[PDB]
Amino acid sequence: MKFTVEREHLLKPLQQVSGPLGGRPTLPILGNLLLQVADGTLSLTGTDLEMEMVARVALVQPHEPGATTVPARKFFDICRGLPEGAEIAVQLEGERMLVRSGRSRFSLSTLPAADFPNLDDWQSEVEFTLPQATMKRLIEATQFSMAAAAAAYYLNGMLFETEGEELRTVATDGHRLAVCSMPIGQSLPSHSVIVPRKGVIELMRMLDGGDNPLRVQIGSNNIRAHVGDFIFTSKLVDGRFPDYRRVLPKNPDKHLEAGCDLLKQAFARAAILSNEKFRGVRLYVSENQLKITANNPEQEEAEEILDVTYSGAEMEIGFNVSYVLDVLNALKCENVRMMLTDSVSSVQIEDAASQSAAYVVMPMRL
Amino acid sequence: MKFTVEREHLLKPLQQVSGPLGGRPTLPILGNLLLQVADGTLSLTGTDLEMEMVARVALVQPHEPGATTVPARKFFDICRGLPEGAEIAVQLEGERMLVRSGRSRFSLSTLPAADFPNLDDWQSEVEFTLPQATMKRLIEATQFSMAAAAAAYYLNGMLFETEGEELRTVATDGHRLAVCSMPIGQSLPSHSVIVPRKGVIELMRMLDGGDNPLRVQIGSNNIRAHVGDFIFTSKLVDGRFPDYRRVLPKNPDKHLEAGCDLLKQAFARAAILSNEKFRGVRLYVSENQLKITANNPEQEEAEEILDVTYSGAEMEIGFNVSYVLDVLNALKCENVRMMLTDSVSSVQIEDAASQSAAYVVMPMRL
Ligand SMILES: [Ca+2]
Ligand SMILES: [Ca+2]
Ligand SMILES: [Cl-]
């Protein structure tokens, strides 16, 4: 195995394929990347046994085919540390891989390619293309509502659902839910899969900001996304996502509309004096007005009064203010609409201008 | 106590007297700020018992004199959380302090001003004024050489020394030393004091890079710095400080000169393959060339060769790379000069083109 490549052709690929890796790896091979030279191309692969990210790098200087694995973060730091435009030459030598650029020389310890984990081949059931921007919208709109380490495995993931001309994402942690749907311009079979939380992070990481479209393929147990010269593949979370469609409030008649940033800043201040553990705030809605109040066990109190659009019955309802702030922070909009039912029922929140995304937050005791 | 003030006028004072972002102050009153209205001014005071920061704001709107202490972080967050342009009206009300701006209202728990700590009256023995930028340069050139935070050395602050027309700072952790001296335009008595590590950080935090005179007053047991409308006071550390004159290598017979950036990048790269828990490199100096090498327990090896100016016998010497990198980062210059003696003696490092600061570094055995 031998190649020589300019530093910057290697740097973004290396940065990307280190993502599946941790601090200390569970076992040494998992802290390595696989390097393969075949058909004029260097391919670099990182894996965590659940997903893999592969980057392909065209080679325009002389090379010899072969494969090995080397410590990912050491190899990346070497490459990042060399001067702009350095030429980096690599040669496999059994138990070590040698790297040379100008008069800088490194020897890294290898483990055999044959021993690098190789996710199994699989068959796609659906395939589509979409703008990178659409995928970014779909993930950003919902990612925050994923569980961080729930007992219920299925909540530590994001649902992707194709249905007709729409792609939709759903995330929930048992307490709040987010759902976003976007037009695909393509007619698709009904599919519903759970992408693992690390997979979602990686999908996000791989989007650059260009009009290279994203190509997605979904199978019974796996998903793959190709952008430019990067291909991400993950196994799916085996499980049935709960049916959130039956969780959206049925007849949520009390409509409040207000400025998103005005609400956000008001909640943000009220939160200072909320219980630091339980984070409860009280909303009192009345004719064209919202009053937000917080207090903590030490009897400190905040109160914010805002003008809003509201004509329903007065009601008072408590919410975890961090859940509310997460939604307002995800909505990127001028005005928000909250749809209320009664003091013991969840609220649905949406951008006033769009039904693309909906958020449901269960209320809390105070 | 009653005052009304622009949020604008409070932001920097609150930032100064408040943080120390975090960290959990283990003695509850110390996480409070003392507010005082008297002779047309609001004064805000933060303290940790060892030091204190006082900020003053002029009050042009109707105000009434008085006390109180309130939670600093809470009060800062509320002020910071209000809209640009806000006016903040405050009225003390027994066990609560009311803060009101627009239709935002807060009531904070108070503790009695009379419970807030001291600090007692002390007498200056030396006073001078210097540009705050001169103080900034002196601390920044040397701060990094102080021991940390249990390390548990014996010396836990920076020496401030007045001699002739210069102010000088010296910091050492027993392995490396930094010294910087700046002229201050006034002839001064010979005086030497130790400022505690956390005092040095707070002092540094107060300084702006504006042109602004800084007035310093040093007593037997305390130091005070006044810039603008902020006054910082710290206790001093008792006991002896080593004499930097006695640590400076007495007769170096080996002179290395090299580009500061090239040297830094070469140390940084070799260091990738040094032992992680204890990152050192070996330097081998010979005519016109510097070879830097590193290796780790996995028997990975790095070698960097640089062209340099070098006069002296061939020699091999090892260094802890963080100590050297810290010096090159502090110099921020074109070329550096290293003055060497032998494999087991300290080196001196300085900017080849200025003599305001000098660094002494002990070698490593590898
Ligand atoms: Ca495979
Ligand atoms: Ca005092
Ligand atoms: Cl497995």
CB spacing of A107 vs B269 below 8 angstroms:
no
Q: What CATH number did the domain enclosing A360 receive? A: 3.10.150.10
Write down the experimental method used for this entry: X-ray
The dihedral of CA B183, B187, B190, B196: what is its sign?
Answer: negative
CB spacing of A109 vs B83 below 8 angstroms:
no
Q: Report how far residue A50's alpha carbon sits from residue B118's, in angstroms, rounded to the nearest whole number.
A: 60
Q: Report how far residue A148's alpha carbon sits from residue A244's, in angstroms, rounded to the nearest whole number.
A: 19
Q: Report how far residue A282's alpha carbon sits from residue A112's, in angstroms, rounded to the nearest whole number.
A: 60
The chain B residue lying nearest A71, using CA atoms, is B300
- How deeply is B209 buried, as exposed, middle or buried, from its count of CB atoms within 10 A (0-12, 13-18, 19+)? exposed
Contacts of B120 (CB under 8 A, 6+ apart): none
Alpha-carbon distance values, A109 to A95, A96, B41, B89 (Å): 6, 5, 67, 66
- Residues B48, B33 share a domain: yes
- How deeply is A303 buried, as exposed, middle or buried, from its count of CB atoms within 10 A (0-12, 13-18, 19+)? buried
Single residue among A56, A88, A123 that ends a domain in this structure = A123
State which amino acid sits at residue B363: P
- Residues B159, B59 share a domain: no
A73 is in an annotated binding site: yes
Residue whose tokens read 């602050």: B157
In the three-class reduction of DSSP (H, G, I as helix; E, B as strand; rest coil), residue B236 is classed as coil
Contacts of B102 (CB under 8 A, 6+ apart): B82, B83, B86
- Residues A48, A69 share a domain: yes
Size of interface A-B (CB pairs under 8 A): 75
Q: Report how far residue B246's alpha carbon sits from residue B239's, in angstroms, rounded to the nearest whole number.
A: 18
Query: What burial letters (b/e) apply to A65-81, b meaning 16+ CB within 10 Å?
Result: eebbbbbbbbbbbbbeb
The whole domain housing B285 covers 248-366
CB proximity A305 to B under 8 Å: yes
Ligand nearest to the CA of B49: 2
- Residues B348, B265 share a domain: yes
The partner residue sitting opposite A265, judged by closest CB among B81, B269, B304, is B81
Q: What is the CA radius of gyration of chain B?
A: 25
Single residue among B101, B123, B145 that ends a domain in this structure = B123
How far is C-alpha A33 from the chain's CA centre? 23
Ligand nearest to the CA of A117: 1
Q: Report how far residue A280's alpha carbon sits from residue A321's, in angstroms, rounded to the nearest whole number.
A: 6
State which amino acid sits at residue A350: E
- Residues B139, B38 share a domain: no
State which amino acid sits at residue B87: E
Length, in residues, of chain A: 366
CB proximity B108 to A under 8 Å: yes
Instruction: Give the experimental resolution in Å.
Output: 1.8
Alpha-carbon distance values, B192 to A288, B159, B219 (Å): 68, 7, 11
In contact, B54 and B203? CB cutoff 8 Å: no
Contacts of B131 (CB under 8 A, 6+ apart): B211, B212, B213, B214
- Residues B259, B329 share a domain: yes
CB proximity A28 to B under 8 Å: no
CB spacing of B269 vs A298 below 8 angstroms:
no
The chain B residue lying nearest A83, using CA atoms, is B265
Contacts of B76 (CB under 8 A, 6+ apart): B14, B15, B18, B19
In contact, B93 and B180? CB cutoff 8 Å: no
In the three-class reduction of DSSP (H, G, I as helix; E, B as strand; rest coil), residue A173 is classed as coil
- Residues B150, B63 share a domain: no
CB proximity A75 to B under 8 Å: no
In the three-class reduction of DSSP (H, G, I as helix; E, B as strand; rest coil), residue B113 is classed as helix
- Residues B91, B1 share a domain: yes
B24 is in an annotated binding site: yes
Query: A360 - beta bridge partners?
Result: A177, A348
Single residue among A222, A247, A272 that ends a domain in this structure = A247
In contact, B193 and B218? CB cutoff 8 Å: yes
Q: Which of A170, A336, A139 is nearest to A240 (CA)?
A: A170
Q: Does residue A219 have a cis bond before it (omega within 30 degrees)?
A: no
- Residues A269, A232 share a domain: no
The partner residue sitting opposite B269, judged by closest CB among A81, A266, A302, is A81
Enumerate the residues of chain A whose CB falls inside 8 A of the CB of residue B103: 304-306
In contact, A363 and A281? CB cutoff 8 Å: no
Torsion of CA A211, A212, A218, A222, to 10 degrees: -120
Q: Report how far residue A272's alpha carbon sits from residue A194's, in angstroms, rounded to the nearest whole number.
A: 36
- Residues A27, A6 share a domain: yes
CA atoms within 13 A on the CB side of B358: 15
Contacts of A355 (CB under 8 A, 6+ apart): none
User: Based on the structure, what is the number of domains in chain A?
Assistant: 3
The partner residue sitting opposite A77, judged by closest CB among B83, B108, B272, is B272
Contacts of B53 (CB under 8 A, 6+ apart): B16, B17, B45, B46, B47, B202, B206, B230, B231, B232
- Residues A252, A188 share a domain: no
- CB-CB neighbours of B137 under 10 Å: 17
- Residues A254, A202 share a domain: no
Q: Report how far residue B271's alpha carbon sits from residue B261's, in angstroms, rounded to the nearest whole number.
A: 15
